[PDB]
């Protein structure tokens, strides 16, 4: 519609705050994926001989026999969170921008983190990587909870058996109980509901003869058309403002969650934390 | 409407004439002439972004069209769209201007805008071994710096000056509206009190005020 | 350098600059200045066309108030984080990684800044590494000796006990090594001699 | 609109490189149908 | 008229903060006079 | 409008009659009588706190 296009420009520069807010949200989401995963400077690689004292990470380390250099647990978690709806929303204006860090880069960051945790231990997050055997690494991690190292140096076999059993039980539990990856599906369902509500309100009259702008411009007179089209041009802007406000609130919540995740990855993975729960 | 009338493979019912999509958009219609099933896809549209190294070293810019296969507008095709003005160098450096899909751009040497995949860091391999330990021999104590916002400006608005200006009938007509001029002022006052409290919990954590000795 | 402090200032400035530029935008009236509709139209039309501007200005002010509330929530979160860092890094040594600077936290100094604080964190960064041959424990007189607080290293021909973060060769005496168990269960135990004083 | 500006001697005849605003002098009314223009010299 | 005064003539005002720069500087100097002279005892109990 | 009408030291060109500000508000005007440059400043205002 050309008359609507002229009326939107005559309505002032109101469509400058929403685009800037969306750009800020996009920049914040691109920064959240970097302040969490991209915490190490150098990228570490796992050694070829995979004999780490007796433990077995053949489920968390990246498997070379797959296209996108991931691990079995990551492969199981990726294939769980689900004209089509995406292209239909794109044809209306709702277009999704591609993230900066791709899935392969996030997988490589997670693999480098695991390599630094296994080979270096807790020294790669406070400076240079320091080689140390994994048995001695887990023996020095017991001295932070009270248990001495003579327990591990005598029951390493049982510890490795329990670790290998728990690693398998992790995959066994992830394969069932669909109410497990719920907090990751929550944001996706919220975004889908928001994109559906923002596109369904285009067929809801805010007070008019119809919802089609062409019918209003044709089957009416200018003195009444300029009043009928205003009731629809004011409702859509209010709906878009409400959508932007909801997106800002959700982005603040996700920023808090990402800060918590970064704190956990910096205090739990980069070293032993003595904080309960 | 407007669009690209293409040939579709939709099996319309013998009584249906129009056709919509999942969310209120006409995508296919029946030809009023001899029976044929068409498809109405929207015209070629997209977003345009400009990558610029800043108006302080040069003026060469790159244009990124989002949602295009470089055949609907050097020239490069990335997951973000089509980039015109940069060249995809096979090297790898740190990201300077984020474009998307792990492909950033910079201004390098002839001075021009180049595009390259991001570098996730160096490439170091720790030599793990069942009888190998790395013990430091010397310290390099350093001092890093971090910045944290503690307070924000305290603003205040007024209905009699922002909504109405130098008038009298406008101020009278504004009173008929709801309590939209006493809750916003209260929210601004709460924000001001919060900003005044955020400084009492960060910089004010000790009762006594200590002083440094002369020597 | 001071990027995160200029960002909030630029945001608070553009929120005020965009709030005054919307007063010149007509929301469906024949003019923008207030003393223009009440000087050319009759009350039956004045009370109708002037409300379309008051409603738009109220909506703009409400949008500004909502943006200010979100910004204040973000500033409150940042201020709580800054207070936590001030209380855990300056008022004492914290064993939390990356919370008081990248590396081993030792000390923190606070400094003021326009609408912000600057923490100077002293970090212990080890350097000049060196390889050594390690072992879980040694076996003397038939019994095993595990280190109390340290790590066993070997310069090739002699076994010493050093610290876990700094190289300090010391002889293996009966003062930093305790006896617990026999020499048939630990995998990787080496032989030596524990010199007792 | 009109504006007098120094056009000090330069390269062969061409529009010089320099910004100069044009202020209006007269605002005479008209209601004609102008679609062409013919110049005239002395 | 500058931008600071132009926004003032439109209703928008900026309230001054409660703690001046001098008080914040004194607070930051009081924390350094206890962190350098004393240790971590000026935050728990007596200095 | 309302407000003080002081003497301005501007440089209004002979074709520029009115004048606006940063917020597109009339800050200066030309007298319909003998040509003089004025400055329209808003009346004395402020805020009260008890
Ligand atoms: C020592 O490391 C090597 C690495 O290949 C491994 O094969 C072996 O099982 C480990 N154990 C011994 C023999 O020390
Ligand atoms: C590690 O566990 C996986 C579980 O499927 C198993 O297939 C693999 O052989 C194990 N490797 C070792 C060395 O225990
Ligand atoms: C219109 O006439 C043409 C003549 O060939 C015929 O093929 C077509 O099916 C007709 N369509 C309708 C609407 O009757
Ligand atoms: C230890 O490192 C510091 C770094 O500044 C250096 O000045 C000093 O000479 C080094 N000393 C040793 C023990 O090599
Ligand atoms: C230890 O040996 C590995 C493998 O040869 C080497 O990469 C590393 O630099 C050595 N470290 C030191 C400082 O001896
Ligand atoms: C190892 O340490 C012992 C300590 O007595 C010393 O005698 C020997 O020369 C050292 N050898 C090497 C290779 O450093
Ligand atoms: C340690 O000494 C015992 C007794 O001589 C011997 O059986 C064992 O093989 C030795 N082990 C090492 C580490 O040399
Ligand atoms: C003006 O001149 C054009 C020349 O093509 C003519 O078509 C038109 O009817 C004339 N009248 C106006 C004022 O448009
Ligand atoms: C008449 O109006 C003109 C407008 O420019 C003004 O300059 C002149 O002084 C006025 N004279 C009288 C008689 O007021």
From Swiss-Prot, chain F:
Subunit structure: Binds to host ACE2. RBD also interacts with the N-linked glycan on 'Asn-90' of ACE2. Cleavage of S generates a polybasic C-terminal sequence on S1 that binds to host Neuropilin-1 (NRP1) and Neuropilin-2 (NRP2) receptors. Interacts with host integrin alpha-5/beta-1 (ITGA5:ITGB1) and with ACE2 in complex with integrin alpha-5/beta-1 (ITGA5:ITGB1). May interact via cytoplasmic c-terminus with M protein. May interact (via N-terminus) with host bilirubin and biliverdin, thereby preventing antibody binding to the SARS-CoV-2 spike NTD via an allosteric mechanism.
Purpose: Attaches the virion to the cell membrane by interacting with host receptor, initiating the infection. The major receptor is host ACE2. When S2/S2' has been cleaved, binding to the receptor triggers direct fusion at the cell membrane. When S2/S2' has not been cleaved, binding to the receptor results in internalization of the virus by endocytosis using host TFRC and GRM2 and leading to fusion of the virion membrane with the host endosomal membrane. Alternatively, may use NRP1/NRP2 and integrin as entry receptors.
Protein name as catalogued: Spike protein S1
Organism phylogeny: Viruses, Riboviria, Orthornavirae, Pisuviricota, Pisoniviricetes
Gene: S
């Amino acid at each position: 519609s050309t008359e609507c296009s002229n009326l939107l420009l005559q309505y002032g520069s109101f469509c400058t705050q929403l685009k800037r807010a969306l750009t800020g949200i996009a920049v914040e989401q691109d920064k959240n994926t970097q302040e969490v995963f991209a915490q190490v400077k150098q990228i570490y690689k796992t050694p070829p001989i995979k004999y780490f004292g007796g433990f077995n990470f053949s489920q968390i380390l990246p498997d070379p026999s797959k296209p996108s250099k991931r691990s079995p647990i990551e492969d199981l978690l990726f294939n769980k969170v689900t004209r089509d709806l995406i292209c239909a929303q794109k044809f209306k204006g709702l277009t999704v921008l591609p993230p900066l860090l791709t899935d392969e880069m996030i997988a490589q960051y997670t693999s480098a983190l695991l390599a630094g945790t296994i080979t270096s231990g807790w020294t790669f997050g406070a400076g240079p990587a320091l080689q140390i055997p994994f048995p001695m690494q887990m023996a020095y991690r017991f001295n932070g909870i009270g248990v001495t190292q003579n327990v591990l140096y005598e029951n390493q076999k049982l510890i490795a058996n329990q670790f290998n059993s728990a690693i398998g039980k992790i995959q066994d539990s992830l394969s069932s109980t669909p109410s497990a990856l719920g907090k990751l599906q929550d944001v996706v369902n919220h975004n889908a509901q928001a994109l559906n509500t923002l596109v369904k309100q285009l067929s809801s009259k805010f007070g008019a003869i119809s919802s089609v702008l062409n019918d209003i411009f044709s089957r009416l007179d200018p003195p009444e058309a300029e009043v009928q089209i205003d009731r629809l041009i004011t409702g859509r802007l209010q709906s878009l403002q409400t959508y932007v406000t909801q997106q800002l609130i959700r982005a603040a919540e996700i920023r808090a969650s990402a800060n918590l995740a970064a704190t956990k990855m910096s205090e739990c993975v980069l070293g032993q934390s003595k904080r309960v729960d | 409407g407007t669009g690209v009338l293409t040939e579709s493979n939709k099996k319309f019912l013998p009584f249906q004439q129009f056709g919509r999509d999942i969310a209120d958009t006409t995508d296919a219609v029946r030809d009023p002439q001899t029976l044929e099933i068409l498809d109405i896809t929207p015209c070629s549209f997209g977003g345009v972004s400009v990558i610029t190294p800043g108006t302080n070293t040069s003026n060469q810019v790159a244009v990124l069209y989002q949602g295009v296969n470089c055949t609907e507008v050097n020239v490069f095709q990335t997951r973000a769209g089509c980039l015109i003005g940069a060249e995809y160098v096979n090297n790898s450096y740190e990201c300077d201007i984020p474009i998307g899909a792990g492909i950033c751009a910079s201004y390098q040497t002839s001075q021009s805008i180049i595009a390259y995949t991001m570098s996730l860091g160096a490439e170091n391999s720790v030599a793990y071994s069942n009888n190998s330990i790395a013990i430091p021999t010397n310290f390099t104590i350093s001092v890093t710096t971090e910045i944290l916002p503690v307070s924000m400006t305290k603003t205040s608005v007024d209905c009699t000056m922002y909504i109405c200006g130098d008038s009298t009938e406008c101020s009278n007509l504004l009173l008929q509206y709801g309590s939209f001029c006493t809750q916003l002022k209260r929210a601004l006052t709460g924000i001001a009190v919060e900003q005044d409290k955020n400084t009492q919990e960060v910089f004010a954590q000790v009762k006594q005020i200590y002083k440094t000795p002369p020597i | 350098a001071l990027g995160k402090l200029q960002d909030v200032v630029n945001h608070n400035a553009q929120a005020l600059n965009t709030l005054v530029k919307q007063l010149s935008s007509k929301f469906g009236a024949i003019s923008s200045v207030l003393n223009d509709i009440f000087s050319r139209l009759d009350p039956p039309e004045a009370e109708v066309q002037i409300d379309r501007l008051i409603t738009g200005r109220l909506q703009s002010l409400q949008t500004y108030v909502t943006q200010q509330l979100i910004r204040a929530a973000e500033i409150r979160a940042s201020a709580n984080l800054a207070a936590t860092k001030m209380s855990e890094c300056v008022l004492g040594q914290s064993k939390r990684v990356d919370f008081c600077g990248k590396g081993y936290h030792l000390m923190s100094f606070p400094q003021s800044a326009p609408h912000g604080v600057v923490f100077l964190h002293v970090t212990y960064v080890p350097a000049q590494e060196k390889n050594f041959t390690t072992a879980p424990a040694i076996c003397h007189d038939g019994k095993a000796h595990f280190p109390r607080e340290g790590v066993f290293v070997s310069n090739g021909t002699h076994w010493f006990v050093t610290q876990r973060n700094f190289y300090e060769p010391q002889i293996i005496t009966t003062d930093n090594t305790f006896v617990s168990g026999n020499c048939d269960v630990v995998i990787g135990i080496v032989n030596n001699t524990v010199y007792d004083p | 609109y009109s504006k007098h500006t120094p056009i000090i001697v330069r390269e062969p005849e061409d529009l010089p490189q320099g910004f100069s605003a044009l202020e209006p002098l007269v605002d005479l009314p008209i209601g004609i149908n102008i679609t062409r223009f013919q110049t005239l010299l002395a």
